[PDB]
């Protein structure tokens, strides 16, 4: 169990970063990023 919660973290956080990578590469579809992160988090 305790080894599964941390397993979801590395799996979900990696999937989220794939989203903001594709949501940013465009010409709103850009203001969505400002809704996902607000504290400058996920700045990687």
């Amino acid at each position: 169990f305790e080894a599964t919660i941390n397993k979801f973290d590395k799996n979900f956080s990696a999937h989220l970063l794939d989203l903001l990578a594709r949501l940013s590469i465009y010409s709103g579809m850009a203001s969505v990023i400002s809704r996902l992160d607000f504290n400058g988090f996920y700045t990687e």
Partner: protein, 369 residues
């Protein structure tokens, strides 16, 4: 999902009696419990119309008021007598529970400053025994007084799944600054404005927030940091309202950062410049949040009652609420060096210290572990 409310002590009765009066008028309901002809969901607080309230010598003042057809000073005295009528007041709550379709919560209005302190400490303990799946929100009001105050905080930090602080001191300033009163009959008018506008999203259904557990789980991230403060500006675009809520002059509170913000806009403002203001608030940096976890600000709109202009309320989870505790914690030790076990006070003393440490640890970039 219905919410059965409770009112304890002279404070809880007076705020609740004026909370219902604000609600009875906001709907087309005459004080005679009869609907007036003159869309708004009214089945949460009212039972087909009768309010779901369980009150507990101010009661006679209500029975003589035109709303009659709508229904010592020691903390030990409150907890003792509450045990003597364990079966009496639980007969009422139980018969009011099963008669409802599906119970959702217990909004409890009490002040921690005589019998409301000791009795409320007894209830919040006994509810978690029988009802283990029912949220218990409390609209507690902040003012031997240091003793009775902190003792309730022992129960309010492990039983109540939420808590909304409303201190009389900061209210008295707003009573003096922008109302120029110098009275309880006036500051409660502001309290009734905060309590009513708090559940405006439950009674007026919108896109989201159609249940109490929707307003709770968004702000409170962990079971311990469950204390919220309010902000109410109208005493004009969405940017005008959002900028005023973040000023320290409006908060009902006498490093530090936010955890979660929810904005309630009860105006008829167009929902197209909403994202523009949130975009602007990020740029000028009018508020800071926790560095460890992703914290965002949420804004919600609603519709004003036509039977009764832009307003605004903000539900805040601010770390600076830890200051109010220290004032209680400080005066306790002074009374501890001035005068059958006297262990409950010391055991309560320890757990409040665990809470304050958790707040000041919440503003650290390594709050995890």
């Amino acid at each position: 999902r219905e919410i059965i409310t409770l009112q304890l002590g002279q404070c809880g009765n007076q705020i609740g009696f004026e909370f219902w009066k604000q609600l009875c008028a906001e709907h087309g309901i005459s004080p005679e419990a009869i609907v007036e002809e003159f869309t708004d969901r009214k089945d949460v607080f009212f039972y087909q119309y009768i309010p779901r309230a369980v009150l507990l010598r101010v009661i006679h003042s209500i029975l003589n008021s035109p709303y009659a057809k709508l229904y010592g000073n020691n903390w030990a005295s409150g907890f003792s007598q509450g045990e003597k009528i364990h079966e009496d007041i639980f007969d009422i709550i139980d018969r009011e529970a099963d008669g409802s379709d599906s119970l959702e919560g217990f909004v409890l209005c009490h002040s921690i400053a005589g019998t409301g302190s000791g009795l409320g400490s007894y209830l919040l303990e006994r509810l978690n025994d029988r009802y283990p799946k029912k949220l218990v929100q409390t609209y507690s009001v902040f003012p031997v007084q240091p003793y009775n105050s902190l003792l309730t905080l022992k129960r309010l930090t492990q039983n109540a799944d939420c808590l909304v602080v409303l201190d009389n001191t900061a209210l008295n300033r707003i009573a003096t600054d922008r109302l120029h009163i110098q009275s309880f009959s006036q500051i409660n008018q502001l309290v009734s404005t905060i309590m009513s506008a708090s559940t405006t999203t439950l009674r007026y259904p919108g896109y989201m927030n159609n249940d109490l557990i929707g307003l709770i789980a968004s702000l409170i991230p962990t079971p311990r940091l469950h204390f919220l403060m309010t902000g109410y500006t109208p005493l004009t675009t969405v940017l005008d309202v959002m900028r005023r809520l973040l000023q320290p002059k409006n908060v009902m509170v006498s490093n530090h950062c936010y955890i979660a913000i929810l904005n309630i806009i009860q105006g008829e403002v167009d929902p197209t410049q909403v994202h523009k203001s949130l975009q602007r608030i990020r740029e000028r940096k009018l508020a800071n949040f926790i560095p460890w976890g992703p914290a965002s600000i949420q804004v919600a709109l609603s519709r004003k009652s036509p039977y009764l202009r832009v307003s605004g309320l903000m539900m805040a989870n601010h770390t600076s609420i830890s200051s109010l505790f220290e004032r209680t914690c400080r005066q306790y030790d002074k009374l501890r060096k001035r005068e059958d076990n006297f262990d409950e006070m010391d055991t309560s003393r320890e757990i409040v210290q665990q809470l304050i440490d958790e707040y000041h640890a919440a503003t650290r970039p390594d709050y995890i572990s």
